[PDB]
């Protein structure tokens, strides 16, 4: 024909290079299991031949159960997956530059060049007041050059249990946001920073974060704290100045507006002790603190070594001032001072200083850190850090070091997460299989942590919608959402399949934690299922990017994700049965 069509997996990308392989698909039916308030995703893959094809459109019926309960077609959003270019290597500028369908772009029609793949993401939101049962419906695909329409048989079962709202779970999610990057992309001026004109491009993507379970909000407290690793500079949200007497003063304006925005959006609730403010960092890159010297009237920097007399002096000034400031705002209880991977000497100097500065109630700042922990059961220092996150590449699957460490922390009421970054596999890159994200989240629970941290909400390059290639890291590493087009009406961001799979993983670990809690009798059955998870092997492509070791390892990430999900849905059904009989 002029146009071919088939249901396809959301687990991996359908790429142009796989054209000839893809044209041989003909999957016409789809079924899945969801809870009330849950979501489901699917995909239809289309193709063209010698001739191009205009105005390709897809559309969805209403969905109806056996009691004629309705889920409107408006809960089904079908979006073209837009392709963007990606250098497939890591700091390898001569690596091949290939298209990946990494963007959940727009609804409506689309043209398709000769001999091309195009795919459309399908997202189904089950309303929070939906009735249980088996729902059926269909999705149609048509075009202009086609005098016919293809048809696709979709059903799904809603189980009689309500997907927990994020605030009803104990899942920890922290994605680092870069609000100045949002300002740069959308040409927000210096003077409009953290005003309503800025907030308009932040609210949507922050709501999105909140709704998938985000609780951590990063705030920079010194300038360029990651040495400009990213496309955009990282300004400090707290401006430092040295006055004529030679003591430091701090301007909290940006920090205050940023945090207040996050309080207004419900990510943070400092009165109720919810959410975290992560202050980056007491160990910024090379210990460098840049400041305006009012005396010499110029910009200067210092680089004092942790533990040194100058260091203790300066951070004592900041921490003391910051604590008082946060106490007047009522924010102090949810505030953490962040560290990062440093020498044990630097880390101990930090924890020792921080612990030594207290308010009237002898409360000190909480402390948060990426740590490299991989073995041994000496927790005495690690327990003085209130939130830690461990890179997946430092977690040894052939041991229970990580899980034992995490379990100790849960007992003491401390937070623990894992993260992925450059060099990790599974991970959440543009070139990753999106299923890897669901796996990652399940791995956080397999390790008995509270959840997942990633550095990379929104660190856009110049024009990521067209090319995400950046000089460091696997492509797409620095962002899980895309921006909208600069002229958008409109939308302020687009989601990605990789992010939707993180979201799936999170909802699905939330189902498992909910069951464990509400059906104590199923708990060890569930725990055993979780603890059966296998870990695929990390390989590396010809150009420096981490990837799956082999086809077997790709398949395992998918099979394992689905296995566990299904297992949990069966436990779901067991609990539901119990209630009915």
Ligand X SMILES: CC(=O)N[C@H]1[C@H](O[C@@H]2[C@H](O)[C@@H](O)[C@H](O[C@H]3[C@H](O)[C@@H](O)[C@H](O)O[C@@H]3CO)O[C@@H]2CO)O[C@H](CO)[C@H](O)[C@@H]1O
Stretch in the footprint of ligand X (CB under 6 A) among 239-247, 355-363, 419-427, 541-549: 419-427
Residue among 35, 452, 455, 571 that touches ligand X (CB under 6 A): 455
Tokens 């809690």 correspond to what residue? 517
Minimal distance, residue 404 CB to ligand X, in Å: 22
Q: Binding string to ligand X for residues 43 to 72, with x set by CB under 6 A, is what? A: ------------------------------
The reply, when asked if residue 477 is annotated as ligand binding, is yes
Give the residue with the Cβ less far from ligand X, 420 or 569: 420
d(CA 266, CA 255) in angstroms, rounded, equals 17
Which residues between 476 and 515 bind ligand X (CB under 6 A)? 477
The reply, when asked if residue 18 is annotated as ligand binding, is no
Counting contacts by CB under 6 A, is residue 452 touching ligand X? no
The reply, when asked if residue 422 is annotated as ligand binding, is yes
Tokens 């799936």 correspond to what residue? 504
d(CA 554, CA 561) in angstroms, rounded, equals 11
Counting contacts by CB under 6 A, is residue 370 touching ligand X? yes
d(CA 119, CA 125) in angstroms, rounded, equals 20
Tell me the β-bridge partners of 560: none
Stretch in the footprint of ligand X (CB under 6 A) among 155-163, 242-250, 279-287, 415-423: 415-423
**Beta-strand (E) ranges in 202-271?**
216-220, 239-242, 248-251
For 100, phi then psi, to 5°, come to: -130, 140
Counting contacts by CB under 6 A, is residue 331 touching ligand X? no
d(CA 351, CA 336) in angstroms, rounded, equals 12
Counting contacts by CB under 6 A, is residue 270 touching ligand X? no
Counting contacts by CB under 6 A, is residue 285 touching ligand X? no
Minimal distance, residue 367 CB to ligand X, in Å: 15
Stretch in the footprint of ligand X (CB under 6 A) among 63-71, 186-194, 317-325, 416-424: 416-424
Minimal distance, residue 260 CB to ligand X, in Å: 25
Counting contacts by CB under 6 A, is residue 229 touching ligand X? yes
Minimal distance, residue 90 CB to ligand X, in Å: 10
CB 292 within 8 A of CB 241: yes
d(CA 497, CA 104) in angstroms, rounded, equals 7
Tokens 């969805």 correspond to what residue? 60
The reply, when asked if residue 421 is annotated as ligand binding, is yes
The reply, when asked if residue 449 is annotated as ligand binding, is no
CB 222 within 8 A of CB 236: yes
How many binding residues for ligand X (CB under 6 A)?
A: 12
Distance of CA 358 to the CA centre of its chain: 34
Per DSSP, the three-state class of 32 is strand
Residue among 235, 423, 426, 475 that touches ligand X (CB under 6 A): 423
Per DSSP, the three-state class of 129 is coil
Minimal distance, residue 356 CB to ligand X, in Å: 26
Residue among 19, 186, 226, 379 that touches ligand X (CB under 6 A): 226
Counting contacts by CB under 6 A, is residue 35 touching ligand X? no
Counting contacts by CB under 6 A, is residue 421 touching ligand X? yes
DSSP secondary structure, 438-477, as one string: HHHHHHHHHTT-SEEEES-SB---S-TTTB---SSSSTTT
DSSP state of 116: -
Minimal distance, residue 280 CB to ligand X, in Å: 9
The reply, when asked if residue 279 is annotated as ligand binding, is no
Q: What is the CA radius of gyration of the chain?
A: 25
For 346, phi then psi, to 5°, come to: -60, -45
Quick one: tokens of 560? 């394992």
Give the annotated binding-site residues for N-acetyl-D-galactosamine: 169-170, 215, 229, 421-422, 477
Give the annotated binding-site residues: 169-170, 215, 229, 421-422, 477
Q: Which residues bind ligand X (CB under 6 A)?
A: 226, 229, 341, 370, 391, 419, 421-423, 455, 473, 477
């Amino acid at each position: 024909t002029t146009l071919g069509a088939s249901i396809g997996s959301t687990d991996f990308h359908y790429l142009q290079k796989d054209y000839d392989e893809i044209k041989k698909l003909n999957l016409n039916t789809w079924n899945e299991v969801a809870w009330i308030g849950d979501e489901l995703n699917s995909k239809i893959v289309m193709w063209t031949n010698s001739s191009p094809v205009n105005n390709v459109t897809l559309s969805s019926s209403d969905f109806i159960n056996e009691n004629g309960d309705l889920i409107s077609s408006n809960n089904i959003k079908i979006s073209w997956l837009k392709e963007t270019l990606a250098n497939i290597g890591r700091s390898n500028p001569s690596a091949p530059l290939e298209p990946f369908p990494d963007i959940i772009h727009n609804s409506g029609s689309l043209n398709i060049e000769k001999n091309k793949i195009a795919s459309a993401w399908i997202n189904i939101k089950i309303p929070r007041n939906a009735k249980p049962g088996i729902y059926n419906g269909s999705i149609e695909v048509t075009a202009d050059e086609l005098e016919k329409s293809y048809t696709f048989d979709y059903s799904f079962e809603v189980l009689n249990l309500v997907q927990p709202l994020p605030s009803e779970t104990n899942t920890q999610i922290e994605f680092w946001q870069h609000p100045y990057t949002i300002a740069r992309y959308y040409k927000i001026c210096k003077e409009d920073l953290f005003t309503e004109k800025h907030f308009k491009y932040l609210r949507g993507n922050l709501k999105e974060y909140r709704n998938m379970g985000g609780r951590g909000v990063i705030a920079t407290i010194v300038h360029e704290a990651w040495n400009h690793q990213s496309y955009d500079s990282d300004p400090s949200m707290i401006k430092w100045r040295k006055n004529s007497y030679g003591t430091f003063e701090f301007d909290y304006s940006h920090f205050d507006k940023w945090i207040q925005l996050n309080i207004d959006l419900g990510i943070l609730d400092p009165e109720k002790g919810f959410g975290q403010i992560k202050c980056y960092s007491i160990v910024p890159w090379n210990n460098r603190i840049q400041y305006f010297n009012e005396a010499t009237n110029k910009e200067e920097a210092i680089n004092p070594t942790p533990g040194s007399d100058l260091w203790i002096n300066i951070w004592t000034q900041f921490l003391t001032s910051f604590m008082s400031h946060l106490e007047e705002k009522g924010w102090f209880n949810i505030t953490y001072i962040s560290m990062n991977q440093r020498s044990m000497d630097d880390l101990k100097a930090c924890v020792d200083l921080i612990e030594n500065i207290t308010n009237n109630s002898y409360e000190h700042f909480k402390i948060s850190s990426a740590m490299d922990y991989e073995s041994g059961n000496d927790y005495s220092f690690l327990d003085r850090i209130d939130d830690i996150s461990i890179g997946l590449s430092h977690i040894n699957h052939n041991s229970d070091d990580m899980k034992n460490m995490a379990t100790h922390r849960q007992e003491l009421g401390l937070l623990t997460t894992i993260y992925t970054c450059t060099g990790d596999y599974p991970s959440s890159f543009t070139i990753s299989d999106p299923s890897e994200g669901a796996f990652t989240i399940w791995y956080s629970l397999y390790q008995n942590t509270n959840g997942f941290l990633r550095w990379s909400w929104d660190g856009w390059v110049e024009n990521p919608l067209e090319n995400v290639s950046y000089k460091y890291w696997e492509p797409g590493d620095p962002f899980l959402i895309y921006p909208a087009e600069k002229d958008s009406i409109g939308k302020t961001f687009y989601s990605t399949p990789r992010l939707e799979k993180l979201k799936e993983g999170i909802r699905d670990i939330n189902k498992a934690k909910y069951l464990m809690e509400k059906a104590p009798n199923l708990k060890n059955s569930i725990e055993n299922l979780i603890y059966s998870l296998k870990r695929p092997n990390k390989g590396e492509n010809a150009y420096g990017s981490a990837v799956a070791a082999s086809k077997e390892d790709r398949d395992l990430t998918i099979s394992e994700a689905n296995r566990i999900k299904n297992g949990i849905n069966n436990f779901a059904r067991e609990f539901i049965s119990l209630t009915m009989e």
